């Protein structure tokens, strides 16, 4: 889809009429998410018999779900999504501190801090990738924070959240690295406003 | 209205020429309603300082467009990157005219960056055309470990794969490192003779040096690289008679600037006829949101096809790249590149200087070299593969059969009874028997020389996930064949779907099935006994793990419960399970027919049961690509009508 400002609805809505799936997965931005939610609202594919999925990118504030967001949408995020910013900062500082302390345990020295902006060191300062390696494996409060070679967190513990019947975002389940848990072995398909329907 | 157009240059001459080009655009279209003005900045060695200069100079004015070129010094090839991020913060379009790196080609990080010249990765496209020129297939890929190398690899593999073709193999190397010859070693003996490569100039020089000292410049061998790999020290180390790729407009930065100004003028004039035009933010500080027409400008600049290019009609691709590229192919004859072809947007026309290939010839050599010396992998199986230690002379004591003929014994190297308790020292013992007999028969039939050795791990192999549930791959002989360690599978192997999904089989040279062995009423009734129909703990039954019957029990979902028993008692070889049954440790052993009735007729202390419920064939399985498939098929069929394996059965399995 185009989904940009002033995008031709006929080109989009026509193909939506050509869309016949009851279960969907979508990818877009949060503004594009709002636009497509409105577009499906006039398309009628928002109905209870319809399922649509989306990654974290098209989501804004979990505490601020816009009215365009339809009820029953579900995604998965980090467990720290309910932790306040202070807790996140403390955990990050703890990760850095434990990495530095592991560097000291292996060698007994503080990690060399970086320089200023009017120059740029060429070599990688082998102590620095030693610190990086000791930072590649982080565990705190039982939650591992070992990162990936791709520069991000690898093998994390995720929580699956779903918008509730009161337009509230709440967690339905948890993916613990090999195991799935989730409430509601059936999904309440509210009658486009409320009152989930019993499947025949 | 005045619109500012920005440039990033360090020449002090192309700056004034860019101003003159802005004036020329004004002459071509007119700036009475919408005045046009130019602005030039100088890229600096310090990335932070030049980014600050861009922020406080080019953003301090509501500049609608910006372009960049490379500095003469090869230091900081990614100089435009801070400019790209600065434009991205407000999502501003940016043009790079001189970059050849696919890093900038990414639009997930560089949203509105456009590049006139395609990167070195797009160079890949011409090699595909080269493949069409010479009707070649035996492609060997060599590439650096850098992101540019991986991107080029992906592009070229896509290009070769839409034609249902696949690269024979791919090799990756760490840039700047040495001792690459060893890597070249494991690529040296492959049957292919045409080569492709992707690296940097110093890496190109290193590999040129290695190939020269490895005699890789001989006949048949040939390869092709980009401009940077045939320049400077790389050109110095390059051999003569090597082919090379050249840009039509590699070094004329002025032409790039002219065409860029023209296309920018076209795009901006198409913009000004529209409404809701938002001025770009003035100054980084005080503005922290998106620019609205920025994405609009990129949308109308994808659609901008600039015909008045000095280098011709400039049409951007889906990703802002000039389509239908203009290249040339030279030949490095006597330390100079000489014209051998011109690449127009989709094909090549040769003109003169007939290609003098590195082997010293002027006629096109086939990019292939069939090997008479072939690799053979096997697994120990006494009725079909007899393995015995050799004595001091390097061989083992040969003996003559009852008929008086000697048994033909080949030198097979095995890691001293491969096991954790084995030192893994691969001693050359002697192998002989049925399979060896038929190998030597078909070999002298096809005259091809052979190298025989059993499998390293001693296991058949199955499609299994890589360690921590990563992608599926083959173990055992299928592993060595999908990797190329051997050429055919010479063993009483069981044909099946998944092997056929990756390997192929000839017509089966033997017909066989499955049955059970026990010791010495209590007759286990074949397969339909609730003793086995219903899994029972008191009764023990298993097979060899990573084998065909494993796949049998896996596909038979209703039998999965018995498969659950498999997980407890699966063996690794036949002999130890045979001893366990003779020791009554194992109640019953399911396995293939032929071996099993052979053992029953020989030892007579154990009894077989159950019919050959799974009809199957022992056939020569090997790679889909190689031509020996039909040849070996017809040869073994001719032996069948000749009853040669009947004589072999009389020699080995019958009369017991
Ligand atoms: C570099 O490119 C510029 C174009 O920007 C060339 O200048 C013109 O090139 C055309 C092509 O033959 C000539 O017909 C014009 O007479 C040239 N004009 C001027 C003012 O020179 C320039 O010749 C190119 N130079 C090199 C070395 O490639
Ligand atoms: C300079 C150098 O490192 N040479 C080594 C060589 O001795 C070794 O036999 C080979 C093994 O692949 O790797 C390379
Ligand atoms: C982290 O990994 C490094 C090796 O890269 C190892 O030396 C160190 O002991 C590890 N520490 C932890 C807590 O795993
Ligand atoms: C190169 O020289 C000859 C000719 O091929 C060959 O015998 C020799 O082994 C080769 N040496 C290397 C290092 O490849
Ligand atoms: C590419 O080649 C064509 C054919 O020779 C020639 O017109 C010019 O060099 C290039 N064309 C364009 C449109 O760039
Ligand atoms: C591009 O050049 C080729 C030959 O190099 C020639 O077929 C034609 O001029 C162009 N290709 C096509 C498909 O038109
Ligand atoms: C010998 O082998 C070569 C290549 O393997 C083949 O071309 C030739 O026909 C063979 N000759 C005989 C008599 O088998």
Curated annotation (Swiss-Prot), chain A:
Residues linked to a glycan: 137
Tissue distribution: Detected in cerebellum.
Location(s), subcellular: Cell membrane; Postsynaptic cell membrane
Subunit (UniProt): Heterotetramer. Forms heterotetrameric channels composed of two GluN1/zeta subunits (GRIN1), and two identical GluN2/epsilon subunits (GRIN2A, GRIN2B, GRIN2C or GRIN2D) or GluN3 subunits (GRIN3A or GRIN3B) (in vitro). In vivo, the subunit composition may depend on the expression levels of the different subunits. Interacts with PDZ domains of PATJ and DLG4. Interacts (via PDZ-binding motif) with SNX27 (via PDZ domain); the interaction is required for recycling to the plasma membrane when endocytosed and prevent degradation in lysosomes.
Recorded family membership: Belongs to the glutamate-gated ion channel (TC 1.A.10.1) family. NR2C/GRIN2C subfamily.
Domain-related comment: A hydrophobic region that gives rise to the prediction of a transmembrane span does not cross the membrane, but is part of a discontinuously helical region that dips into the membrane and is probably part of the pore and of the selectivity filter.
Function: Component of N-methyl-D-aspartate (NMDA) receptors (NMDARs) that function as heterotetrameric, ligand-gated cation channels with high calcium permeability and voltage-dependent block by Mg(2+). Participates in synaptic plasticity for learning and memory formation by contributing to the slow phase of excitatory postsynaptic current and long-term synaptic potentiation. Channel activation requires binding of the neurotransmitter L-glutamate to the GluN2 subunit, glycine or D-serine binding to the GluN1 subunit, plus membrane depolarization to eliminate channel inhibition by Mg(2+).
The protein's name in its UniProt record: Glutamate receptor ionotropic, NMDA 2C
Name of the gene encoding the protein in the UniProt record: Grin2c
From Swiss-Prot, chain B:
Post-translational note: NMDA is probably regulated by C-terminal phosphorylation of an isoform of NR1 by PKC. Its phosphorylated state is influenced by the formation of the NMDAR-PPP2CB complex and the NMDAR channel activity.
Single annotated GO MF: enzyme binding
Catalysis performed (reactions): Ca(2+)(in) = Ca(2+)(out); Na(+)(in) = Na(+)(out); K(+)(in) = K(+)(out)
Disulfide bonds: 55-284, 396-430, 412-431
Tissue/organ expression: Detected throughout the brain, in brain cortex, cerebellum, thalamus and olfactory bulb.
Binding-site positions, glycine: 492, 494, 499, 548, 592
Gene Ontology CC: cell surface; cytoplasm; dendrite; dendrite membrane; dendritic branch; dendritic spine; endoplasmic reticulum; endoplasmic reticulum membrane
Localization annotation: Cell membrane; Postsynaptic cell membrane; Synaptic cell membrane; Postsynaptic density membrane
Glycosylation sites: 37, 179, 215, 252, 276, 326, 344, 416, 447, 467, 534, 631
Entry remark concerning the domains of this protein: A hydrophobic region that gives rise to the prediction of a transmembrane span does not cross the membrane, but is part of a discontinuously helical region that dips into the membrane and is probably part of the pore and of the selectivity filter. The extracellular N-terminal domain (ATD) is a site of allosteric regulation to modulate overall receptor function.
Name by which UniProt lists this protein: Glutamate receptor ionotropic, NMDA 1
Organism, as annotated: Rattus norvegicus (Rat)
Gene assigned in the entry: Grin1
Part of the full-length chain shown: 25 to 796 of 938
